[PDB]
RNA sequence: GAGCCGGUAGCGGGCGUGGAUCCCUGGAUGUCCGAAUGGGGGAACCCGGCCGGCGGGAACGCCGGUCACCGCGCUUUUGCGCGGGGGGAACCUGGGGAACUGAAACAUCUCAGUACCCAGAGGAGAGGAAAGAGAAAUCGACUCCCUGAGUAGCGGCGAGCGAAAGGGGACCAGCCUAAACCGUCCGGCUUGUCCGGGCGGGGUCGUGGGGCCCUCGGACACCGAAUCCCCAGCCUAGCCGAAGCUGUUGGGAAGCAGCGCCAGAGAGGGUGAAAGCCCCGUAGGCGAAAGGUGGGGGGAUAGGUGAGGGUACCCGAGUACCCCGUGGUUCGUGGAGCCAUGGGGGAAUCUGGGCGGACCACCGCCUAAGGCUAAGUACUCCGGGUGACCGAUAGCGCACCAGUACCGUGAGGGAAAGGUGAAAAGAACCCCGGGAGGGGAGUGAAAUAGAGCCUGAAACCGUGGGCUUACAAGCAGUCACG
RNA sequence: UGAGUAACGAUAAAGAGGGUGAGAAUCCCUCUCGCCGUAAGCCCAAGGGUUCCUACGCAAUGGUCGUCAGCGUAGGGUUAGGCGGGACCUAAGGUGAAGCCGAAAGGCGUAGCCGAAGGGCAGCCGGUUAAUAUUCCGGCCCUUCCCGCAGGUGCGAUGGG
């Protein structure tokens, strides 16, 4: 496996839908976006002990990178 | 299992002739090494061991009607060594 | 008619046949059931060659396949099978007690 | 022969492991005939070849005694 | 139990009740191949090492072993034991993700998370211990059934798709992990007291546990692989086993006859023409031995639990809440519950925090966010059985030397043909003639059943005959007279 | 069915004798024509997997018979110290320890390797077989390489040149 939170995952599946609303006013629009599509987070490491990368993956970065600081 | 025979007498005209000279014409083993082929003509069959060729060949027509055949895997070896006995005891068809 | 099968090469008179009148078979065997009645040949004409006999229309055929023995001769034509009296150890012999009371027993005979 | 095995099943090495090598010439000698006499010979080629796997198998089955 | 040396009959022999075949179980070498593993490479090729062994010592080949590759287990001496990885008719779960069609347009919708493709999976899966549920002030895993209306439901309120509670019933089992909290021993840390390793305790079940004190405890609950044994059953091989003759036509009879029996077995199939009692090891009943496997039953194993009270407090993923995003669930934003996750921000310990019913309350329930969980439906490639289901251009396309030939580069698609006849006794010789073929024979109850053959028609090709027809126009033909 | 008409793979044409055999314009021999000849020649390399050779075989198939036959029945039969290739090489290309990327199967490719008429790399003539052959024999020939010997020596990695 690859791009997984690496703890854990975001490889979600991604439905794109909408248009146009016009409902809490009253007359009614038309749009619909029966669609697929794709969102995904981010890549970067840092430090063990001496010589080392991480990867690792985005937001839990700002958590997750004073655990093994805690180690 | 690894035994020492490899062969059986093949029978040409030339072969017949083969005595005359020492040639020796065995159907054999689709792999024997020429060494096999010394040592085998060797020590399982008692000689000094000189001159080789050897033949593959993939068989050699057939019928029986009502489908198809074709004559199985099948291979040749040849050789004559320097003192010119041996196997006197088996040319003795013709 | 497997590997299992009846007779023993025997000595039988049977009934249906034009003949009637048996005893000795001569030589059971496999699937097909073969075995002779010795008892009517007929002719074949065994070719003309010397390998042959030379003048042939050949004399020994006996091959009436059926099962149709009136099974054995120890006092008695056919009978059913029963089984056996054993008593000696392994000893089976399916003796037929069927009227007459005889295996056609390899003791006695063949 | 009805005891083909008992001696077959004697032999403990070399002695029968080299004997083999001389018991499988005597079929060695089956092959020379093309047409030298192959006359009663057809079975005396035949399960004189059978002995020869009992000799492998004695051997890798005393082998198997042995391991 | 005793005759055999596959389909195939010849051809040359043998071995044999001092079991060979045949079957059944474990044996032992199993060429090459393929995840593929010594190393590459056009599958069926090749090239070596590193040991020991043959060849005339080694220069030359043979032998057998060992020679990856991942990821783990750790033994963190270049490595050890040990892990997988291959598929495989279907099977379902994830992950992925399609139109036309249907709307008599069609882009929303639909069909439909279907089809397909991978991933994974085991003989089942998956789910499965309740942040239920919905309304009695319930119930208490779930799935499978059928019901539960297809009503309650949702929308271009077009065509549609389509519940859950309840109720019945199937099987009817539930427990493991983090909690500095303490001890522990161990690692780092550095002066101890941060984190990290194990071990104990606890590691919940429904609001309890953690700790101090007081009554406390004086044992039954058997394993949801806790373990093994035993009845454990298939596997295989089996053995029975009842009981008619005689006559008769008859090409052949077990039909007809006559007289007879049988039996917890007159299913069926077979023997030359129709057998309950001739044969079929036909079904009644019984075997079987050692294995190679395992629910019921059984026992021991029972890890693992098996009292309430007191003080306040240290306790199931920091990340849930909220916002914008899409997802599911019958739910396409309509006000929009829930569970889902997109991003975005961001709180706390049983004075919780979530719920059900936009929102608030109040009412009541529940205690979330680390996991295995059987037996229960499903599926049928395999085996067995079954038959108002089928007969040889039906049935798989395939019934016996086929999905093989053939064709199509390849991707693929995709043939035709069964039965002579009691058995072959399948035709010796005879003669025509090159031979095939044909006649005699004789074979056989039938060869006008003799091998392209049971029986064999259809049109289409002949003769043999019969009847008529050469000066007339006519689809055809029907009627009238000869 | 139309049809024994169309058709007969070329406008580059043989004849006759003699034999053979049941039976020959097509088959075997002789003879004479004819035609190629800048190929319808000899030769290797892809193609393919048997003919070729011998006997008998004639219905098959050869687009006609056909005693012939590349068709049949079975047998026959080609081997390399140096011919080609493989145990050497490496371009593109391919491959893939890394390395870095994908919903999932994936992405690339560092290093090396795989892969030719490329390159490097050890000869030739005659002779006899039914058939093959510069690998069979003869002559001649040079071969990387091993051991054993002499002799000299600075030697030693595909490392860097």
Redesign the pocket.
């Known amino acids: 496996?690859?791009?997984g939170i690496h703890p854990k995952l975001?490889?979600?599946?991604?439905?794109?839908?909408?248009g146009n609303v016009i409902?809490?006013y009253s007359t009614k629009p038309?749009i619909?976006?029966?669609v697929?599509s794709?969102?995904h987070?981010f890549?970067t490491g840092q430090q063990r002990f001496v010589d080392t990368?991480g990867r690792v993956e985005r937001?839990?970065r700002?958590?997750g990178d004073s655990?093994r600081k805690?180690? | 299992t690894?035994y020492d025979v490899i062969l059986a007498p093949?029978?040409?005209?030339?072969?017949y002739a083969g005595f005359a000279?020492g040639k020796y014409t065995f159907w054999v083993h689709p792999k024997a090494?020429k060494?096999?082929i010394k040592?085998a003509v060797?020590?399982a069959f008692k000689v000094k061991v000189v001159?080789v060729?050897?033949?593959h060949?993939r068989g050699?027509?057939?019928?029986?009607?009502?489908?198809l055949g074709?004559r199985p895997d099948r291979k040749?070896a040849?050789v004559?060594v320097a003192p010119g006995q041996k196997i006197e005891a088996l040319e003795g068809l013709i | 008619m497997?590997?299992?099968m009846?007779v023993?090469?025997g000595d039988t008179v049977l009934?249906?046949?034009?003949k009637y009148k048996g005893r000795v078979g001569k030589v059971?065997?496999?699937l097909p059931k073969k075995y002779a009645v010795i008892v009517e040949g007929?002719?074949?004409?065994k070719?003309?060659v010397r390998v042959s006999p030379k003048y042939?229309?050949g004399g020994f055929?006996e091959?009436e396949?059926?099962?149709?023995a009136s099974k054995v001769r120890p006092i008695c034509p056919?009978?059913?099978?029963?089984?056996?009296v054993r008593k000696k150890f392994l000893e089976?012999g399916?003796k037929i007690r069927?009227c007459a009371k005889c295996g056609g027993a390899?003791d006695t005979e063949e | 022969?009805?005891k083909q095995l008992e001696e077959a099943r004697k032999l403990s090495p070399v002695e029968l492991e080299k004997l083999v090598r001389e018991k499988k010439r005597e079929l060695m000698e089956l092959r020379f005939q093309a047409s030298i006499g192959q006359?009663?010979q057809?079975?005396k080629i035949r399960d004189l070849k059978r002995q020869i796997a009992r000799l492998l198998?004695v051997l890798?089955?005393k082998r198997?005694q042995n391991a």
């Not at chain 3, 396949?65 to 149709?68: E, T």
């Open positions: 496996m690859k791009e975001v490889p979600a599946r991604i439905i794109c839908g909408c409902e809490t038309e619909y976006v029966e697929c794709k969102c987070p890549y990368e937001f839990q700002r958590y655990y805690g180690r | 690894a093949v029978l040409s005209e030339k072969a000279e090494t060494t096999e040592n060797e020590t001159k060729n050897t033949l060949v050699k027509k057939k019928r029986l009607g009502r489908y074709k040749k040849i004559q | 497997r590997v299992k009846h023993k090469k009934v249906a046949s034009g059971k065997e496999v007929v002719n074949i004409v070719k003309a042939p229309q055929i091959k396949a059926p099962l149709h056919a009978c059913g099978k029963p089984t056996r089976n399916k069927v390899l | 022969m009805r006359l009663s057809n079975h198998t890798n089955e198997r």
